[PDB]
Amino acid sequence: TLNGGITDMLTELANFEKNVSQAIHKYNAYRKAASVIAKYPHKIKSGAEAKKLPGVGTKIAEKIDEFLATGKLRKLEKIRQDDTSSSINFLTRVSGIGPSAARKFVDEGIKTLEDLRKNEDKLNHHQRIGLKYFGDFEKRIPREEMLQMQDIVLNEVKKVDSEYIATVCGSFRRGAESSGDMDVLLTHPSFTSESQPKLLHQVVEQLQKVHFITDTLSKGETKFMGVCQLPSKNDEKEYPHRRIDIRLIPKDQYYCGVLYFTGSDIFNKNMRAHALEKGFTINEYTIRPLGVTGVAGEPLPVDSEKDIFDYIQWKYREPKDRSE
DNA sequence: CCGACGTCGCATCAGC
DNA sequence: GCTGATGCGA
DNA sequence: GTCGG
Numbered sequence: 123t124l125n126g127g128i129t130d131m132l133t134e135l136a137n138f139e140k141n142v143s144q145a146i147h148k149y150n151a152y153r154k155a156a157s158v159i160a161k162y163p164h165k166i167k168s169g170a171e172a173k174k175l176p177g178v179g180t181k182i183a184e185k186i187d188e189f190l191a192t193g194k195l196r197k198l199e200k201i202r203q204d205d206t207s208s209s210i211n212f213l214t215r216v217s218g219i220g221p222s223a224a225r226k227f228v229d230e231g232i233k234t235l236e237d238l239r240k241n242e243d244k245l246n247h248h249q250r251i252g253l254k255y256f257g258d259f260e261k262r263i264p265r266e267e268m269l270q271m272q273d274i275v276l277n278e279v280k281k282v283d284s285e286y287i288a289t290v291c292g293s294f295r296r297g298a299e300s301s302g303d304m305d306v307l308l309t310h311p312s313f314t315s316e317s318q319p320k321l322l323h324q325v326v327e328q329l330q331k332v333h334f335i336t337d338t339l340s341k342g343e344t345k346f347m348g349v350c351q352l353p354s355k356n357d358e359k360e361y362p363h364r365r366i367d368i369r370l371i372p373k374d375q376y377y378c379g380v381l382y383f384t385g386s387d388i389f390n391k392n393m394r395a396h397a398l399e400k401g402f403t404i405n406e407y408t409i410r411p412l413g414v415t416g417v418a419g420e421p422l423p424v425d426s427e428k429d430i431f432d433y434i435q436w437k438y439r440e441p442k443d444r445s446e
Numbered sequence: 447c448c449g450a451c452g453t454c455g456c457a458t459c460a461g462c
Numbered sequence: 463g464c465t466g467a468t469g470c471g472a
Numbered sequence: 473g474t475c476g477g
């Protein structure tokens with residue numbers, strides 16, 4: 123919060139670029155700038171000072187100058203009172219409503235949650251779920267609830283077939299005190315690259331049967347996106363509904379998957395950079411050697427996370443030490 | 447100057 | 463009905 | 473919007 127006013131500003135600008143102007147690369151630019159400023163251990167005195175940071179250029183330096191001198195940005199203040207733009211930006215907070223749908227809604231006079239509630243038949247299945255759990259989906263999940271959620275998922279998975287391997291990844295696996303969602307990775311010895319596709323279905327079905335999974339956003343043969351909720355403790359207040367994903371991955375690509383979806387974002391980029399250095403290319407699925415001309419060879423056998431590290435001469439890093 | 451900038455599974459649309 | 467495009471989330 | 477080939 124050292125430069126909180128600046129990073130709040132850049133984040134708000136980022137959102138209007140994505141949701142209103144539909145300029146995804148400007149969105150990412152503003153977030154890159156906000157992130158590098160968020161890490162900078164001094165209170166910024168000038169735009170010139172900030173411009174030394176990678177990701178902060180001429181225009182943002184100009185904006186920072188205006189903010190420091192006046193306490194605001196004229197453009198941002200203006201788009202804030204724009205009823206059309208502020209409404210488009212807001213509606214995209216509904217899961218399933220992106221920039222395109224939000225624009226169409228506002229175009230025909232639908233600008234609020236209240237308006238969405240009045241117009242169910244113009245909402246697809248995902249958008250209806252996003253509306254129903256609008257509040258819940260914006261809450262974070264305390265680690266304690268995540269632990270209880272993990273208890274349920276690992277138990278039910280093993281109950282379906284004890285040969286399943288399941289891992290809760292993401293921020294939880296890195297040991298975070300709270301999480302945005304629950305990322306579950308699943309594999310099974312009978313599922314390889316060279317291979318039934320009811321393997322995901324039976325796990326989803328069992329979680330529905332014990333009433334853990336409450337809604338489905340999408341479900342194919344390899345990826346489930348949905349909603350879950352912990353059971354209510356006696357006559358206590360109900361737990362918020364939570365977002366849960368389940369990914370079914372071939373055995374031979376499982377740990378490349380666990381690595382990637384454990385993160386963090388930044389650790390992943392660093393690791394992949396070091397791999398090219400050492401002559402390897404790592405994606406979410408595999409690790410392949412690069413020839414002298416840059417030609418990628420066959421995927422290398424991986425039977426653990428650590429295997430990936432050994433391939434690239436890196437010593438195993440604990441998930442709790444993967445913030446970068 | 448001017449193109450890159452993460453990527454891909456699933457739901458649903460657009461065209462035929 | 464089928465194929466490819468588009469929107470969306472993360 | 474920022475970067476860099």
Ligand SMILES: Cc1cn([C@H]2C[C@H](O)[C@@H](COP(=O)(O)NP(=O)(O)OP(=O)(O)O)O2)c(=O)[nH]c1=O
Binds near residue numbers: 382
């Ligand atoms: C979206 C995204 C995902 N990942 C792979 C690694 C992210 O850390 C990770 C898990 O994704 P997540 O749930 O979007 N992020 P998180 O679990 O670290 O954070 P949170 O608990 O959802 O807030 O998956 C990336 O490497 N880059 C990304 O941009």
Ligand SMILES: [Mn+2]
Binds near residue numbers: 292293301302304305
């Ligand atoms: Mn997550």
Ligand SMILES: [Mn+2]
Binds near residue numbers: 304367472
């Ligand atoms: Mn996630």
Ligand code: NA
Binds near residue numbers: 172173174176178179
């Ligand atoms: Na800079």
Ligand code: NA
Binds near residue numbers: 214218
């Ligand atoms: Na949305």
